[PDB]
Amino acid sequence: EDVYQNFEELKNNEDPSDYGVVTKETGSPVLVLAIHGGGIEGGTSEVARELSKEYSMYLFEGLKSAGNSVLHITSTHFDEPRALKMTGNHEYVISLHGYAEEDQQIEVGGTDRVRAADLVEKLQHAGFPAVLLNMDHPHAGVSPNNIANKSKTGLSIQIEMSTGFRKSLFGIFSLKSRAVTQNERFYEFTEVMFRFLKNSYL
Ligand SMILES: [Zn+2]
């Protein structure tokens, strides 16, 4: 269960200084979407901001000192107006998430089955611990109600990163310091992502 059913409810219950909506609109066909940034799914803000160097980005960040879990709105309920605008303005979506697991793991899903499999192959070749989830896996990112699918094509890739994998990318795993302690593994991972995105979406 989430605390809030939709963005209007979150907005009416939370101090606006406790969350942030951040956009970068470049006209790239691909949108990088991180609806659980900041302290909600730690590290997804930093991956999103690095990929925004080449791609359009939507970021919703939890900025509380503690209790950011209350700001998590599941993808099939996430309706913040700037997210609805940006998703509909893009051809394709890559959606970044974190899940609780100490082992290093990346679970890839989404509606874009050909590109999701290609991304898993490219990550595995590069020595990253990715697996492909198929259509009947719970939370496979395939609902028409999922914000990531509300694009011009409906084709998305969902990237779920374990706690262990996200912590491996930063010297200090905090809201304050992830953004200024990105390590060699962070840039190695984001470069595999840049190579995949440029090759896969010509
Ligand atoms: Zn998430």
Q: Enter the tokens of residue 82.
A: 């700037």
What is the rounded end-to-end Cα distance, in angstroms, of the chain?
A: 39
Signed CA dihedral, 197, 97, 104, 120: sign only: negative
Q: Resolution of the experimental model in angstroms, please?
A: 1.0
**CA nearest 78: which of 151, 10, 158?**
10
Q: How was this structure determined?
A: X-ray
- Angle among Cα 150, 146, 134 to the nearest 5 degrees reads 110
Judge whether 142 and 112 are in contact, CB under 8 Å.
Answer: no
Query: What is the C-alpha to C-alpha distance for residues 151 and 197, in angstroms, rounded to an integer?
Result: 17
Number of domains in the chain: 1
Distance in angstroms (rounded) separating the CA atoms of residues 52 and 47: 9
Helices 113-125 and 184-200 pack at an angle, to 10 degrees, of 140
Residues 6 or more apart whose Cβ sits within 8 Å of residue 44:
34, 36, 37, 96, 97, 98, 161, 166
d(CA 3, CA 26): 33
Q: How is residue 142 written in tokens?
A: 């395939």
Beta strands in the chain (DSSP E): 19-24, 30-38, 56-62, 92-99, 106-109, 130-132, 155-162
Query: Three-state DSSP class for 93?
Result: strand
Tell me which residue of 110, 93, 97, 83 sits closest to 31, measured CA to CA: 93
Opening angle at CA 186, ends 66 and 48, nearest 5? 60
Coil vs helix vs strand at 61: strand
Centre of ligand 1 from the C-alpha of residue 36, in Å: 5
CA 196 to ligand 1 centroid distance, Å? 22
49 vs 63: CA distance, rounded Å: 16
Element (H, E) at 46: helix 44-51
Q: How far is the CA of 34 from the centre of ligand 1 (A)?
A: 8
Compute CA 28 distance to the chain's CA centroid, rounded to the nearest angstrom: 17
Are 29 and 91 in contact by the 8 Å Cβ rule? The answer is yes
Enclosing domain of residue 30: 1-202
Spacing, Cα 161 to ligand 1 middle (Å): 9
The Cα–Cα gap between 196 and 177 comes to 28
Q: Is 117 helix (H, G, I), strand (E, B) or coil?
A: helix
Say how many Å lie between the CA of residue 96 and the centre of ligand 1: 7
